[PDB]
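[SOLVED] Predicted holo structure with 2-acetamido-2-deoxy-beta-D-glucopyranose

Edit: marking solved, answer below. Original request kept for reference. I posted the sequence and ligand SMILES and asked for the 3D complex as structure tokens.
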Amino acid sequence: LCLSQQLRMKGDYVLGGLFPLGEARTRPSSPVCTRFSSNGLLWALAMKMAVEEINNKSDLLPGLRLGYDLFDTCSEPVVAMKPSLMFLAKAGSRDIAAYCNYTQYQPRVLAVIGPHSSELAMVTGKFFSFFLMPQVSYGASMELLSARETFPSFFRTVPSDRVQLTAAAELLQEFGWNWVAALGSDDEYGRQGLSIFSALAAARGICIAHEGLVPLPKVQDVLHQVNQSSVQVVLLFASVHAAHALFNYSISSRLSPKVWVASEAWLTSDLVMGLPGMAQMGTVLGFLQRGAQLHEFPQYVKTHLALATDPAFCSALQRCPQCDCITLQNVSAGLNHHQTFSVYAAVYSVAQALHNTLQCNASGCPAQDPVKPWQLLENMYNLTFHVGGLPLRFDSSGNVDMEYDLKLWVWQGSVPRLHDVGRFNGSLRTERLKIRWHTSDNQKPVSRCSRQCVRRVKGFHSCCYDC
Amino acid sequence: SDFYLPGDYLLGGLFSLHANMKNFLQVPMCKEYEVKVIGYNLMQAMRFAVEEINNDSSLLPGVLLGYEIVDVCYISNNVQPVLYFLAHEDNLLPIQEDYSNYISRVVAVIGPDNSESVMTVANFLSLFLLPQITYSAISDELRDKVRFPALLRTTPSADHHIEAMVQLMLHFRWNWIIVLVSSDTYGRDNGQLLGERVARRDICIAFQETLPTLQPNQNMTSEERQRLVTIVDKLQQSTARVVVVFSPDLTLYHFFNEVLRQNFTGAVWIASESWAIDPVLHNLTELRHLGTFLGITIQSVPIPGFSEFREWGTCNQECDNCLNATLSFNTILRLSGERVVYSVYSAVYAVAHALHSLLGCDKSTCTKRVVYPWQLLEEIWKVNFTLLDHQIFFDPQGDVALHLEIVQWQWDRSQNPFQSVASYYPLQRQLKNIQDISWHTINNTIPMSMCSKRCKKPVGIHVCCFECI
Ligand SMILES: *[C@@H]1O[C@H](CO)[C@@H](O)[C@H](O)[C@H]1NC(C)=O
Ligand SMILES: *[C@@H]1O[C@H](CO)[C@@H](O)[C@H](O)[C@H]1NC(C)=O
Ligand SMILES: *[C@@H]1O[C@H](CO)[C@@H](O)[C@H](O)[C@H]1NC(C)=O
Ligand SMILES: *[C@@H]1O[C@H](CO)[C@@H](O)[C@H](O)[C@H]1NC(C)=O
Ligand SMILES: *[C@@H]1O[C@H](CO)[C@@H](O)[C@H](O)[C@H]1NC(C)=O
Ligand SMILES: *[C@@H]1O[C@H](CO)[C@@H](O)[C@H](O)[C@H]1NC(C)=O
Ligand SMILES: *[C@@H]1O[C@H](CO)[C@@H](O)[C@H](O)[C@H]1NC(C)=O
Ligand SMILES: *[C@@H]1O[C@H](CO)[C@@H](O)[C@H](O)[C@H]1NC(C)=O
Ligand SMILES: *[C@@H]1O[C@H](CO)[C@@H](O)[C@H](O)[C@H]1NC(C)=O
Ligand SMILES: *[C@@H]1O[C@H](CO)[C@@H](O)[C@H](O)[C@H]1NC(C)=O
Ligand SMILES: *[C@@H]1O[C@H](CO)[C@@H](O)[C@H](O)[C@H]1NC(C)=O
Ligand SMILES: *[C@@H]1O[C@H](CO)[C@@H](O)[C@H](O)[C@H]1NC(C)=O
Ligand SMILES: *[C@@H]1O[C@H](CO)[C@@H](O)[C@H](O)[C@H]1NC(C)=O
Ligand SMILES: *[C@@H]1O[C@H](CO)[C@@H](O)[C@H](O)[C@H]1NC(C)=O
Ligand SMILES: *[C@@H]1O[C@H](CO)[C@@H](O)[C@H](O)[C@H]1NC(C)=O
């Protein structure tokens, strides 16, 4: 199939890449992942399509070829740490020097398309910070990666968790639910979400009645503590598995209906919607990403998979040994994936930053010495790049700005359907006259505490009073 | 200089010699930051351990143990050091699929004193399996060996600190406490761990609040002033008189100034490992009116001749203000004993013992063979020896069972500033040998921190609170 031979392409300014191509020691040997992951290969194909189309363009990067060096990274950081060392080694050499600062380095890759995993993105960004290598990541949406103190050269094309948590806090404030309960997964994702939402609520007036963590597949104690306070709105910032476990337990325990606020992790997961008896657990109100999609990605991937089988093209022309023995039906399921657009836009943003740095114009590019990776950072912050006709911008803190849609689970024949009732764009606007609530009638559930009054201070943060 | 000693086998070191006391193109070197005396004391401890090892003809005989100490910043600079350690003598680090035959500049690195820097360094070093024993790092994430194969430790994890805190609370019968955490990951993790541990031991937390990130010696905006006064007002309003603080010693200056200004008195402050043995914070002497101060530390082990050694004495590897800054701290540091100094001492001696066993010498010349870091890491798990009447051996999860100690702050410049009042034994998870504690009450009555007097219907979420019927 000669698919892995396309993972490297020569060019004037080659690009980096860290993708979850594969999945899974008393000696210092790099682990080898043999299992195949469809999402990683699809994202790699998406970035390859982006680079090929950009090279096809004449207005962007005229007269210059853009290369790429894709690399297989498992979920582990040990496997992905080596490719970064290869990235920052001098061109034509396999040795990386230990210099005093970044100015003495000559990396062989202009930029790096960072890993999808959040913890792996953390490790890679902390490593790339020393050399000031501009790394843009897809799907790494943790908030602590926005701290410019420790990640001076980390960008992203997906909104951070802070945006959706701010949207949730604004939803709680607008609807008057100033006495809520906050929960999250025991992993890093839930803990960080809880830490952000505590500060957001404390700033916005809302305060947490009980702040707990639901362990991954205890939970009995967590929902008991949630019961112990008369709170009708619970914010569940948990992954798919922890949220599914909590919902299954509450279905087995017959817990009273409540207004659950859903993170993007389990708002769209079919694992939780398909859980029997879920319809008897109140409304689910979450914020979902409002992003575009690569219209021509499925056509590109199908024609490229068909073309790769032809021996003539392969003869005319390893990182992923299991990427060769593959059929189209092994990647057809995840063809309509959102992260492909994120990867495509990240590649386009890096190319636009390179085009601006060289001060190129429509006809061509001025002659100069090769641009070091750290020179990209000046033109990469506060940069407006167009991706498929929709403008995008990098914040001063290195995050893209995009809108959100407030969706609620509307039940009809035990088949939950997501319905648009609001839109978050930094200032939440909702249409509450259409929301169908779970109470006996169509009345908004009430979950408010009295901050003024005999007064007995109550709450996890000593905020409210029991008059 | 004192950052480099030539030897047959080098010994990397990562010490926080400076702290952020207050454009990404230029990198701020750690030299211009203010001098941290504790980091310099730990560096002196490691140097003294190496010199003592070289003195003895019974440990590593005929082989000179050298070291290459470099200055790691709290968070700022922690990549370059490890790159310098892993490179060859020509400052070149080759990249290969296998590292079994690869020999690095250093054979083992005494890890940093910060959990996050230890995590980053261990993630970098997992490729080469470079042995690394960290001191004063308490993050629970470092106990598992799946993601940190080459990481060890010389202090108990946060579980033992939280257990000692809960045992101290149970001994004096406090079931109504307030927990204050910092905005950084260490404070949040420690607070969550304490909450989980204490929810099942019939002790209820009144409330939990986060102190804003606040480096001292800087101008603070009105927003954080408002946050601080709100936190202190909530502290004073609540009936709980036992406050447990999980925050780095840098943040607490503004908070303590604010509570002193608010004139709130009569609370038992329990300190985490971070600021329990802070001399630069204990020197305030204006906190004596805030009540009694306790803390969770490592037992003081009197190292003979360390104080005399301390008094007699590339880039990011030199500091100038350290000696003058620590000169004013000589008396209090000498009186306070050695708590983490012993941790660094034991880590260096454990590396030396592992190297001695691996080289296979017995009170004579060694085999002077080539040593790969993974071999040293493999041989370092089985070290077992008596050191200052203490046993040093590693648990299967890379922890050393060094007894903890609850310490109490007393302000007497002629005596020990941190007086031990309780001893905690990690192996049996029991706190015993509690001595007399000087309380802030009238006749030394133990402080009462309970949300309801002993009588029964419950009121509020917490079980500890009720009303007598
Ligand atoms: C680039 O353009 C050529 C024709 O000029 C076309 O055949 C090819 O598919 C294009 N590549 C893309 C769209 O990736
Ligand atoms: C749901 O909870 C029940 C009750 O504990 C348990 O037996 C069952 O395995 C759970 N179901 C799933 C699908 O995990
Ligand atoms: C949870 O709350 C309801 C309403 O307060 C209570 O009746 C019920 O017993 C509690 N437990 C469960 C398992 O539903
Ligand atoms: C391709 O799909 C087939 C059928 O589903 C499966 O057995 C095979 O393992 C897949 N190939 C891989 C994962 O490389
Ligand atoms: C664009 O760059 C080319 C290449 O150096 C240069 O010759 C030309 O003058 C520039 N401007 C225009 C308008 O083409
Ligand atoms: C940089 O940001 C400023 C202020 O937000 C904006 O006015 C300006 O257009 C930006 N510069 C660009 C996009 O080159
Ligand atoms: C956000 O949407 C509101 C309407 O809900 C609109 O008035 C406002 O201008 C929008 N802001 C931006 C930055 O697009
Ligand atoms: C980088 O280190 C070199 C060492 O020779 C020094 O001359 C240069 O000024 C440094 N550059 C910085 C700190 O930006
Ligand atoms: C022993 O170590 C001390 C410092 O601890 C040093 O001054 C001395 O030279 C060493 N050797 C002897 C023989 O005392
Ligand atoms: C701000 O900093 C200056 C300079 O250190 C100091 O004089 C002043 O008191 C500080 N505070 C305010 C409120 O200006
Ligand atoms: C206590 O502190 C307050 C607040 O600054 C101050 O006004 C007062 O004089 C102090 N002393 C007493 C006895 O209240
Ligand atoms: C400790 O506080 C005293 C009294 O204010 C002060 O003079 C001294 O500089 C401080 N620091 C020391 C002794 O290191
Ligand atoms: C330390 O202070 C002394 C005066 O006590 C001074 O002469 C000396 O230069 C200082 N050393 C430094 C700043 O390294
Ligand atoms: C270390 O040796 C001592 C003394 O022989 C013994 O009591 C102890 O159990 C040993 N520890 C281990 C882990 O073998
Ligand atoms: C303290 O104890 C002494 C000695 O028994 C006694 O005289 C005094 O009344 C006690 N004070 C209080 C306040 O209980």
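OP edit: Chain B touches chain A through 54 residues (CB under 8 Å). Thanks to everyone who chimed in.
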